[PDB]
Each structure stands twice: as C-alpha cells, then as structure tokens.
Design a protein around this ligand. Structure first.
Ligand SMILES: [K+]
Ligand SMILES: [Mg+2]
Ligand SMILES: [Mg+2]
Ligand SMILES: [Mg+2]
Ligand SMILES: [Mg+2]
Ligand SMILES: [Mg+2]
Ligand SMILES: [Mg+2]
Ligand SMILES: [Mg+2]
Ligand SMILES: [Mg+2]
Ligand SMILES: [Mg+2]
Ligand SMILES: [Mg+2]
Ligand SMILES: [Mg+2]
Ligand SMILES: [Mg+2]
Ligand SMILES: [Mg+2]
Ligand SMILES: [Mg+2]
Ligand SMILES: [Mg+2]
Ligand SMILES: [Mg+2]
Ligand SMILES: [Mg+2]
Ligand SMILES: [Mg+2]
Ligand SMILES: [Mg+2]
Ligand SMILES: [Mg+2]
Lengths: 202, 99, 63, 138, 146, 132, 101, 85
RNA sequence: AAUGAGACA
RNA sequence: GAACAAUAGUAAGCACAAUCAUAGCACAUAAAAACGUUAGGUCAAGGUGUAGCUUAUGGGUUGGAAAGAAAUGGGCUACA
C-alpha cells in the first residue's frame, strides 16, 4: 500500500532562512521542524516522548513564526507606515501646555465569530481646569454644577458617557457636555444672588 | 438644603439629562424600565437553547448521504432489527389492546 | 433629545410628568435604535387616544 | 540564487488630514499560562524597540476564580470537587505614539496574538480645545 | 494547497491532479448540501455579517407570473424557466421591455438555448437553423444595434 | 474511589496513550487543555456558545473519520478563525483524506459563519505511552 | 428533537415571551408609576393579565442545554453539574483545572 | 437530540454488562454467552440509503480521463446493493 | 456481655 | 518462599513514596490513595440490555397537592 515518505527535515539546509518555512502562525508539524524536541512526563526509568505523534507539542501555541531573526525583518518592512512624534512635545508638561484635553477610548479583541462588545462604547474625557478661561465666579459655579466629577486636589474634570451606542456618538456627546458646561458657568442668572452664608465654599 | 441648592441640583440634572422635577422613589422605576434592556429580550435568554432541531436534522440527512456515520444510531437500528426477528415489535395504530 | 415628539401632549397634566420620565429613560437606553424609540412614543399617543372617556372621569380634564 | 525580483508593492498615500496624537497607549493582555505571556511580552518588546517606542512593561497582580460542585450524582453532599480558573495578567504601556504608528503596531500585535490570550487597549488621545471653547464666546 | 503531512504530500505530477481535484470536489460536494437544504444554515452568529458564507438560492423566490419574477430567472442562469415564463407573459398580453427581451436572447444565444454546466441536476457546427434565438429575433417589434 | 476519566489497571496488556494515562487532577500540571479560547477568561463573555460548538466538533470529527481517528482533537480559536488539529491513522487512501478535508472545511465554515482551518498529522498507529 | 418534552416546552415559552416582551413593557410601565390616575392603572391590570400565560418572564426556566436538568446548572456555561465535570475532567474546557490551595 | 448520543464503545461496554458485581462470586448463572458485534465490519465511506455517488469516496474520481461529478443511483440498482449487504 | 444468616459459587 | 557475621528467590507494572499546587525554602494543609469488600447509592443527569404501553403507562390546557395528634435529628437566637 501507500508508504510514508521521509520527512523534509533531512532535506532542510543548515543555513536556510527559517521564516520562509513558517510565514504565518501554524501548528507544530513534526516533519517541518528540524529541532528534536521532547516533552511529557517521563516513565519511571526512561525519557520523555519524541516529537512525532506527540499531542503535548501540539497543544502549545508555538512561536516559530515570530523568531527574533524574523521579527527584525518583519518590523523593518513596517517602518514605512509610520510618522514621527513631534520632538517639541518631549516633556509631558509641554503636552499639557499645548494639548489640554485627553480622551480615553477602549477597543476589545476576543476569539469568536463576533466583535460586538457593549463595553467598548465608553468615552472618558479629562480636562485640566487650569488651562481654561474660567473667572473667579464662573469657576466656582462650574464646580458646584458638575458635582463629584471634579477632583479638588488634582484639579481635573472627568466626564464619562455611556448612553450613546457608538464611541463616535459618545465622543460627540462628551465634547457637547464640556462646551455647554462652560457657556453656562458664565451666565450670572438673577436668582444666583440669593446665596446663603452656609453655602459659601470659603 | 436651601433654595440655592435646589436650583443647582435641577440645573445640573437638566444638562446631564436626568429628571428635573422631583420624583417619587416608586416612580423612578418607569425610568429604569426603559433605561435597561428587558429580561425577555436579552441575548442570554431567547438564544439560551441551541437549536437542536437543526443539529439533529442535519446529522440525520448526512447519515443517509454517507458523509457522516453515527455509531449510536446504528446501535439502535441493529437492536431494533433483532426485536423484529424475535417477534416483539411495535404494533400499528389501533392494535394495542382493542383486540 | 426627544422633546420634538412630545408636541401633541397636555403640557400641564400628569401626562407630561409621565411622558418626560419615559423620554428620560429612553435617553439613557443604549440598546434601542432611534426608529424603535419613536415607536414607544407613538404607542403612548395611540393608547391615550383610544382611552379618552376614562381620563374625563379621572378628575382632571386632559387634552 | 533564483529569487522573485522586487516582489513588494504597497502604497501609502500621504493625505492632508493632521495625524492623531495619542498621549499614552495601554495594552493589557490576559491569559491562563504565564509561559505564553512571558514569550509574548518578549515579542512585543523586541518589535517596540525596533520601531522606537520606549515602552514599559509591568505585571498586574493575578486573580483566581473558584467554585464548588457536588461530587456524586445522588446524595453524598459531604464530598465536594472544586475547580479553579486562573487569569494571569501583563500590561505593556506605550507613550508618545502617533496615530499612524499606532495602527501598524496594534494590527501587527493583534494578528500574532496566541489563541489562549486576549487583550484590551486603552488609548489616551489628546487634542486641543473645542472651537466653541477656544473661540471666545462670552 | 496540499497538507504538509508526509503521507498526504504528493509524490508525482500525476498525484497532484488527483489530489487537488479531490479537494475541489469536496468543496462542490459540501456546497451541494448547503444549497440542497437552506434551512439548516440560516442561523447567523457572524458579526460583522459575512454575505459570502450564507447559503444561496437557485429556485425562483417568486412563483407568481410577473415581469419582476421573470427577471429573477434570467439572472439566476435559468433558461427553461425563463423561456416558459416569457411565453406565458406574451400570452397574458402584458408588454415586455426590449432590453429584457435582448437580455433573454443573450442568455439563450450563449448556451444555444441550453443549460449551463452545473454540479448535478468539438467538430461540427453547434449552431442550429431551427433555434429559438432566430425565432425570438424575428418576433422582436423593434431591433436596435445591440 | 474516584473514576473520572480514568483507565483502570488490567495486568500489563492494554496500551494507553499519553492523554488517557493521566488522571484529571493532573490537568495544568502534566497535560494541557485540549481546547483553548477566550470564553473562560476572567472578564470575557460568550462562553456558552464556544462550549456547545466545541462539543459538536468532538462529535463531528469522530464521525467524519470512522476508525481512523487516533485520539482527541485540539481546537484553537484565533481572531475569528477556527483551527482543528487531528491525528489520523493510515487507513483511508489519500484521495479520501483530501475529500474529507475539503468537505469538512467548507461545511463547518458555512455552518458557524467563520473560517475553519483543518490540519492533519498522520501516524502509523496509536502512540503508546505506558503498559504494552 | 430536543432531549425531552420539558425542553421543548421551554423553547415555546421563551419564544412567546420574546414576541410580547415590548408590549408587556409598555403596559407594565403604567402600573409601576403612581403619578397616573388610579382608574387608568386598574384598566392596565386587566389588559396585562389578558395576555397569554406563557408570555411571562418569570415562567422561563433555566435548564442544561445538553441533558435538561432543571437544577444544578451553572449560569455561565449553561451546563448541568454532571456534564460540566464530564467536559472539565477530560481537559476539554480551556482554563478549567482542579482547585488546589 | 444529537448531543444525547454516545460512542459505540460506551454502548457495548454497558450492554454486555461484563464488569458488574454479578460476575464476581458466581452470582450470574445465565450460562448464555452474550456476543458483541462490531457494527463497523461492513463500511463503505460515502455509501448511504439515498444512494449518492460521491466522486472520490466510492466511485473513481477520473473516468476515461474525465473527472466524474456528483450523481445519484437508480432505484433498481440501489435495491441490489442493499441486498448484497 | 444472652440472642441473630434466609435462594451467593 | 525471610534470616545481613544472610538459610531460595529475581527484575519490572499499579499504589504508597518522591514531585506538583497554596507565587522563597521549610513545616502544615490541600491533592492523591491500587486490587478488592458492602449484589452499598443512583433506570428520575444522560445513554442503554431485557420486559411492558401504543386513540394510551403518550401529548396539551385549567385548577388543586391541604393539615400536624404526636415522636425525633441537625441548626439559629437565648436563658444575662
Ligand atoms: K429502560
Ligand atoms: Mg430521555
Ligand atoms: Mg403590586
Ligand atoms: Mg424561576
Ligand atoms: Mg454500578
Ligand atoms: Mg430465644
Ligand atoms: Mg517505593
Ligand atoms: Mg511548595
Ligand atoms: Mg508535605
Ligand atoms: Mg482529602
Ligand atoms: Mg502522595
Ligand atoms: Mg442492592
Ligand atoms: Mg449501608
Ligand atoms: Mg435503592
Ligand atoms: Mg430513560
Ligand atoms: Mg423509580
Ligand atoms: Mg431500551
Ligand atoms: Mg397524561
Ligand atoms: Mg424532643
Ligand atoms: Mg448537617
Ligand atoms: Mg443579642
């Protein structure tokens, strides 16, 4: 009947480039790996099983396709698709000076036929109040208006939005809250003069 | 609690979208009913059961087409044949005890 | 913002108090599409239109 | 000796839209086996160094989930068999990463993700003030 | 395309045609089952949707006699269904667009008023004088360049 | 006496493979998990759908390859693609193996709405770890 | 065929609940609010109780998808306690191991 | 009810009942030898009751240099084949 | 600290 | 079927042992514990041998399984 051909390990060159053999992630093929590798708990007086017909070497997620020789070759080709970070934004303090708004977003990757994660719609917008144009009266009203979202020690304002289904709608809604909270802190309405001496922050 | 605090509590609620006018503890449930997804419409509830009808029917047709060989169904058929040979089978309709 | 769908409602009775709770709840709902949200508002218009005589004897006349 | 001459054909159209600047990018990989995560960190660090990212790697504390089930199929409630699901963590922080460099690094990282792990990315995009706030409007 | 296992690695150019066509027949064999029983594959858990994995349909989704249903049979590579339905439409008295008439001729002319090559149901002039292509062409009220 | 997934001692004449020779309490100590996926992590959803799909493949692969299957499958789920690794005896002709590989890849891909990879390693007989 | 007649009944019950899920929610909103007149709430109670019996969320029963055991079912895997051990002891579930500490 | 089925070895290991406490101290005096029949002794991978000729499994792939396609079997022909089994 | 076994080879 | 200043026993398999887990070791605790015994428990997790039902021991709808004279087991709260 049909016979078994000798494995290609014998015909493998000594100095051949490994990444050409495994371009993508593939399971451990005993014939395609020149390395004699043994794993499995040995018998009372014996040696661990060979690399042919062994399931223990098949369960493991191999890293033969990410060899350090291949990593340098892979990454260097990707260097075209990049742009440098501006040198003037070296210190983190300067980043706040030139960009006072930071926005946190999350993306989730999981194994399955679906990518829809309801936890990926959250948007966290944090603004340092010292970089805005609030007056003495306007800043005091904004703190009294936003409530617990403002930290008195770090002077940071955190706005978290979850109602919009998409991250782009939440991002547009989050920035909408920031601008309407600022245009409202400057409207000294008539009833504001009815301040009580127990409501004063100082 | 002063009149100044009432305006600020309402003004903040107006911008962020909560309820402005005072609402009872029991009356807030109607907001909760529409805010959250009802229990009967969650994917965990109506899609709880895998469709065994498609799973059983598909493997039934593949068994007759020679692409899937089921040992368990073969066991039933082989034993069912022996019962017929021994003379103990399933009677037709209207043959149980009326005769 | 679902206020534009509440134009045809009694502005002062308990209907406004009840409807604005529904609209506030729908605003916080992420799982429902916009077209589905209008269906809920339309159904309440249908329900209050069908049952008119009961509101007359409720004690407050509502449009 | 015989090789396909010039088998490379990608295009990178440089448009006029300003690129998106990310203040800091956080990657949190979670898995069941430490050895896979230990090797995956080395792959991520080696690729990050070559691109010039200056990343920092730290290990968040692990958490263990336990639950108890009955042993036999009838009575015998004094004998239990327990089980345990172990989720090990590893976080790789990225700082001062541009949007264009972020896209390639993430997709290269995600495609080589092992089957037994998953990850979450927290991107801290930075930008200037809104037009209404920046432009003086009372 | 072939497995890396030594027992399945082809050993000669003769094996390559035999091995590869065996795998190709496998795809056709499975797709026949998919199209034979559409109701066993209507379940969708793919997000985002993949339109390249849903089962297809070859039988006319509309069993009514109408022009709109006639176009479905034309686009589904159906010749016998199209010619029978077109005759019924003509007997019904309803007008038929010239472009649809031209489209029906193109399907019939290319295959010679025959069915295409399906999974399962040289010398000499293949064209025949007694053919439906000439018959319908003469019956055309208006004939354009196309 | 515990009896979960164990093969009892009967003289020294019954072969046992590596998977069957270890008690279930040796999991994550001497032998790994036959399947790996995200569903059973800490804060991940969609764990029941993976389990039922896993069981179906244990019953489909066992029936598609009658007698020629060596031991249990290994299922790896990366991204949205499903990889199935199997050990198959030298029983069917290579023509039938490629037919079944082509048949399995297309049918499962159109059933679970996800790409499927089927990798096979062929062995002359069942691998024996103890006894024999 | 589902594994038992009881399992078949649950599928019908879940299907009926899904159809009347939105209609029940709209009517149930009137009952659970005290600002509407009491006369309208009494009429709502009549209508909500006139709906079919099977269209009730509380009547939904969580069973095992394999053996349909009415109790002893983990909610995460939707499996009976016996079947869960059968799959976990063979190593067929990822990340599940015998607890030792 | 596809998930409710089991393996052939599991079924025969239980039906024979050659491992219980009955056959320990002579408690079982049946004296009739229950026989196990391997149900896979006659197998034609591809053959089915409907009689589908799959090119590659039962019928040869190439016929006179032409690759065969999927085809069914005549009713009279299928009856004889079943009569052979 | 008196008593007990039936249709198991 | 053993005598160590040794007199018929020998080397392997399973179990004990060692190792592993409880993020250092150690100790401790988990975990493990063969072949058998009690025809021990489970046809109601599921499957299935044999026997029985088949316009009924099958399927569906509606309503209803109350009640503690008394005895006892394991618990919570107490008698400060
Ligand atoms: K029985
Ligand atoms: Mg049953
Ligand atoms: Mg009540
Ligand atoms: Mg309940
Ligand atoms: Mg027993
Ligand atoms: Mg006496
Ligand atoms: Mg010893
Ligand atoms: Mg230790
Ligand atoms: Mg110890
Ligand atoms: Mg113990
Ligand atoms: Mg020990
Ligand atoms: Mg007994
Ligand atoms: Mg006892
Ligand atoms: Mg008993
Ligand atoms: Mg039963
Ligand atoms: Mg009973
Ligand atoms: Mg039976
Ligand atoms: Mg009955
Ligand atoms: Mg008492
Ligand atoms: Mg107790
Ligand atoms: Mg007390």
């Amino acid at each position: 009947r049909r016979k078994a051909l000798p494995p290609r390990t014998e015909k493998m060159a000594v100095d051949q480039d490994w990444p050409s053999v495994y371009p993508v992630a593939a399971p451990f093929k005993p014939s395609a790996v020149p390395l004699p590798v043994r794993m499995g708990y040995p018998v009372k007086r014996g040696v661990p099983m060979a690399k042919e017909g062994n399931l223990e070497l098949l369960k493991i997620p191999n890293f033969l396709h990410l060899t350090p020789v291949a990593i340098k070759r892979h990454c260097e080709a990707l260097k075209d698709f990049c742009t440098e970070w501006p040198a003037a934004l070296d210190s983190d303090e300067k980043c706040e000076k030139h960009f006072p708004i930071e926005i946190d977003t999350a993306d989730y990757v999981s194994a399955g036929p679906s990518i829809r994660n309801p936890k990926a719609r959250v948007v966290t917008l944090r603004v340092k109040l010292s970089s805005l144009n609030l007056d003495d009266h306007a800043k005091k009203k904004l703190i009294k208006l936003v409530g617990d979202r403002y930290c008195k020690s770090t002077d940071v304002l955190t706005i978290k939005t979850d109602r919009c289904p998409l991250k782009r709608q939440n991002y547009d809604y989050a920035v909408y809250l920031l601008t309407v909270l600022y245009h409202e802190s400057w409207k000294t309405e008539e009833w504001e003069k009815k301040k009580t001496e127990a409501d004063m922050e100082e | 609690l002063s009149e100044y605090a009432v305006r600020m509590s309402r003004l903040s609620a107006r911008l962020f979208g909560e309820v402005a006018r005072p609402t009872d503890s029991k009356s807030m449930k109607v907001v909760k009913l529409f805010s959250e997804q009802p229990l009967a419409k969650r994917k965990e509830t109506y899609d709880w059961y895998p469709n065994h009808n498609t799973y059983f029917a598909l493997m039934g047709t593949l068994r007759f087409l020679g692409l899937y060989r089921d040992e368990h169904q073969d066991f039933r058929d082989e034993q069912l044949r022996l019962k017929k040979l021994r003379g103990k089978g399933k009677p037709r309709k209207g043959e149980g005890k009326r005769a | 913002f679902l206020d534009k769908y509440l134009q045809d409602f009694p502005k002062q009775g308990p209907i406004r108090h009840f409807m604005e709770l529904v609209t506030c709840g729908l605003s916080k709902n992420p799982y429902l599409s916009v077209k589905q949200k209008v269906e809920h508002i339309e159904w309440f218009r249908n329900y209050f239109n069908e049952k008119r005589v009961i509101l007359k004897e409720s004690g407050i006349q509502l449009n | 000796v015989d090789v396909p001459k010039d088998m490379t054909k990608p295009e990178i159209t440089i448009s006029d839209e300003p690129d998106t600047l990310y203040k800091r990018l956080s990657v949190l990989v979670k898995g069941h086996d430490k050895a896979v995560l230990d090797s995956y960190e080395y792959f991520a660090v080696l690729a990050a160094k070559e691109l010039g990212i200056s990343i920092k790697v730290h290990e968040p504390p692990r958490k263990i989930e336990r639950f108890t089930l009955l042993k036999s199929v009838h009575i015998f409630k004094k004998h239990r068999v327990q089980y345990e699901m172990r989720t090990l963590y590893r976080c790789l922080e990225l700082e001062h990463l541009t949007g264009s460099t972020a896209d390639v690094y993430l997709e290269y990282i995600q495609r080589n993700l092992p089957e037994g792990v998953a990850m979450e990315v927290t991107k801290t995009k930075l930008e200037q003030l809104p037009e209404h706030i920046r432009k003086p409007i009372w | 395309v072939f497995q890396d296992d030594p027992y399945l690695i082809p050993t000669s150019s003769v094996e390559s045609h035999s091995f590869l066509l065996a795998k190709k027949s496998g795809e056709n064999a499975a797709k026949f089952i998919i199209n034979s029983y559409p109701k066993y594959f209507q379940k969708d858990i793919a997000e985002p949707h993949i339109p390249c994995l849903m089962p297809e349909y070859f039988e006319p989704q509309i069993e009514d006699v109408s022009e709109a249903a006639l176009q479905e049979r034309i686009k589904l590579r159906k010749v016998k269904a199209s010619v029978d339905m077109f005759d019924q439409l003509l007997q019904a008295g309803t007008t038929v667009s010239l472009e649809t008439t031209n489209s029906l001729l193109d399907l019939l002319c290319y295959y010679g008023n025959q069915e295409p090559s399906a999974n399962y149901n040289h010398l000499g002039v293949t064209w025949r004088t007694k053919n439906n292509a000439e018959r319908i062409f003469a019956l055309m009220p208006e004939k354009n360049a196309h | 006496k515990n009896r979960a997934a164990r093969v009892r001692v009967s003289k020294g004449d019954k072969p046992v493979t590596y998977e069957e020779a270890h008690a279930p309490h040796y999991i994550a100590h001497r032998k790994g998990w036959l399947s790996l996926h995200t569903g059973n992590l800490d804060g991940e959803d969609h764990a029941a759908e993976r389990t039922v799909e896993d069981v179906f493949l244990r019953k489909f692969m066992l029936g598609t390859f009658p007698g020629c299957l060596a031991d249990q499958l290994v299922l790896k789920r990366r991204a949205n693609q499903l990889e199935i690794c199997a050990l198959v005896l030298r029983q069917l002709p290579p023509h039938k193996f490629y037919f079944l590989v082509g048949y399995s890849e297309t049918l499962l891909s159109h059933f679970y709405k996800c790409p499927v990879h089927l990798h096979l390693q062929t062995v002359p007989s069942k691998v024996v770890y103890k006894y024999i | 065929y589902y594994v038992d007649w009881k399992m078949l009944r649950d599928v019908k019950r879940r299907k009926m609940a899904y159809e009347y899920a939105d209609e029940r929610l709209r009517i149930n909103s009137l009952r659970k609010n005290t600002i509407l007149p009491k006369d309208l709430q009494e009429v709502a109670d009549e209508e909500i109780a006139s709906l079919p019996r099977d269209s009730c969320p509380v009547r939904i029963r969580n069973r095992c998808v394999m053996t349909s055991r009415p109790r002893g079912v983990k909610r995460r895997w939707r499996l009976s306690r016996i079947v869960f051990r059968h799959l976990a002891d063979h190593g067929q579930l990822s990340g599940v191991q015998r607890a030792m500490w | 009810s596809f998930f409710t089925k089991l393996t052939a070895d599991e079924l025969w290991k239980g039906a024979l009942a050659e491992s219980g406490a009955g056959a320990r101290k002579g408690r079982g005096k049946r004296t009739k030898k229950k026989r196990r029949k391997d149900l896979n002794r006659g197998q034609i991978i591809g053959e089915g009751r409907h009689g589908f000729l799959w090119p590659g499994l039962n019928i040869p792939l190439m016929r006179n240099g032409a690759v065969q396609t999927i085809a069914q079997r005549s009713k009279e022909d299928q009856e004889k084949v079943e009569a052979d089994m």
